[PDB]
Amino acid sequence: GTILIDLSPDDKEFQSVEEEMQSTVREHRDGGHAGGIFNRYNILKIQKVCNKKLWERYTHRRKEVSEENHNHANERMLFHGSPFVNAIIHKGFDERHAYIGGMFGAGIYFAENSSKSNQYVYGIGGGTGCPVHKDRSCYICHRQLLFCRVTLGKSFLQFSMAHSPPGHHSVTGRPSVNGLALAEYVIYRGEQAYPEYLITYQIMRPE
């Protein structure tokens, strides 16, 4: 049921998605080990992911969360990087996309920093890098991230598939050391995220 619509680079919607991608790059404490050394990306394509059944699955669950939280879905747009992006865009998020060893338990993880999600495109810790060159910092191979609509509801604040903490719909990992890191988030129901945009890109070698 999924169809992909290409956005023109002249479209305001392409431009605002690119800006979120580029402006949320940061340096990582691994010095680029997992995701590569770069300060910006070359955006190659931005596609809208359209699937009626998966959308309705998302909005059904969003209403349930909203009704449990004074009519407030607490909806965000967040990045997700995964070796399973093709499964996700066709069949939705489910328990097979959960980070089983994540620091906030077995759930599906999302990031404000695009560069954090970039660290997972080739797997946990960057795996062995790109399939073709076995390079986690490959500047040639095309990568894909998802920019996702995510329902947080009442989020458990952690300063720093399972179930949400009792009385909560998600977990927030608040950075408590790296002053420049943005928040990361975990949901425990695949129906709480819709993979809105598929972004194809390369990391760029700093000059």
Ligand X SMILES: CC(C)c1ccc(-c2cc(=O)c3ccccc3o2)cc1
Residues that bind ligand X (CB under 6 A): 79-83, 97, 99, 109-111, 116-117, 120, 123-124, 184
Fill in the amino acid letter for 129: G
Chosen from Zn ion, ligand X, none, partner binding at 120 (C-beta under 5 to 8 Å by type) = ligand X
Least separation in angstroms between residue 165's CB and Zn ion is 40
User: Cβ 52 to ligand X, closest distance in Å?
Assistant: 25
Distance from the first to the final alpha carbon of the chain? 43
| Partner interacting with residue 130 (select from ligand X, Zn ion, none; CB below 5-8 Å by kind) | Zn ion
- The nearer residue to ligand X, 65 or 171, going by C-beta atoms, is 171
Residue 111 interacting entry, from ligand X, Zn ion, none, C-beta within 5 to 8 Å by type = ligand X
Binding site for Zn ion (CB under 5 A): 130, 132-133, 138, 140-141
The CB-of-168 to ligand X minimum distance in angstroms stands at 18
- Nearer of residues 111 and 130 to ligand X, judged by Cβ: 111
Q: Measured from the CB atom, is 24 or 66 closer to ligand X?
A: 24
Nearer to ligand X, 98 or 138 (CB): 98
Which residues are annotated binding-site positions for Zn(2+)?
Answer: 130, 133, 138, 141
175 binds, among Zn ion, ligand X, none (CB under 5 to 8 A by kind): none
Three-state SS string across the chain, please?
Answer: CCEEEECCCCCHHHHHHHHHHHHCCCCCCCCCCCCCCCCCEEEEEEEEEECHHHHHHHHHHHHHHHHCCCCCCCEEEEEECCCCHHHHHHHCCCHHHCECCCCCCCEEEEECCHHHHHCCCCCHHHCCCCCCCCCCCCCCCCEEEEEEEEECCCEEEEECCCCCCCCCCEEEEECCCCCCCCCEEEECCHHHEEEEEEEEEEECCCC
